[PDB]
Design a protein around this ligand. Structure first.
Ligand SMILES: O=C(O)CCC(=O)C(=O)O
Ligand SMILES: [Co+2]
Length: 199
């Protein structure tokens, strides 16, 4: 893809149904909820987290917390399937020492999007981002360091894993409004798992 970035198409295919079963298990303790941005806007993407640290929104800005702001209980632990798939994808991408402590689980309903942003809430930029696509296909935008920087448009389908780090660690990215459709394992949505070293 780019410098320090690669797309491992259909990498998570074999682990997919186990990952989805574990998403439901995580969601049973920490439900999927549409977070409100520090500006006051409800996001179209429904989110939840697992592992030690979880990505959330607050009035001060975006941050990581070991506590779920909705349940007021800690986020569920990182499932074995998640940890194993992430490790294998990381090593295959050229980052063998990747040790995630956070997994952001994103649910995209038809028409849901995630506008162009940078993953800049993590202090250690040496650690990559491992992103797993499950279910309905979506067009992933991948740009550069600036907002006006040219965007590459890639389709991400069920089982595709994108890993970006190194030079591409702070590159702008996002998902375009999800096209309506169906998938045998996720029914009417697209699930995405983003593994990060947050601490
Ligand atoms: O859904 C995707 O493929 C990207 C998710 C993402 O960019 C994020 O969670 O920060
Ligand atoms: Co992101």
């Amino acid at each position: 893809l780019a410098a320090g970035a690669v797309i491992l198409r259909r990498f998570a295919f074999n682990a997919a149904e186990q990952l989805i079963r574990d998403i439901n298990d995580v969601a049973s303790q920490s439900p999927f909820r549409q977070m409100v941005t520090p500006g006051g806007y409800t996001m179209s993407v429904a989110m939840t987290n697992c592992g030690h640290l979880g990505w959330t929104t607050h009035r001060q800005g975006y941050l990581y917390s070991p506590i779920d702001p909705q349940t007021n209980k800690p986020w569920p632990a990182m499932p074995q399937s998640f940890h194993n798939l992430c490790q294998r994808a990381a090593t295959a991408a050229g980052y063998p020492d990747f040790q995630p402590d956070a997994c952001l689980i994103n649910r995209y309903a038809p028409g849901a999007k995630l506008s162009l942003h940078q993953d800049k809430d993590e202090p250690d930029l040496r650690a990559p981002i491992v992103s797993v696509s499950l279910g309905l296909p979506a067009i992933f935008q991948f740009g550069g360091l600036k907002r006006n920087d040219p965007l590459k448009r890639l389709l991400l389908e069920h089982g595709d894993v994108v890993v970006w780090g190194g030079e591409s660690r702070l590159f702008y990215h996002g998902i375009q409004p999800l096209k309506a459709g169906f998938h045998p394992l996720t029914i009417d949505c697209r699930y995405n798992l983003t593994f990060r070293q947050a601490g």
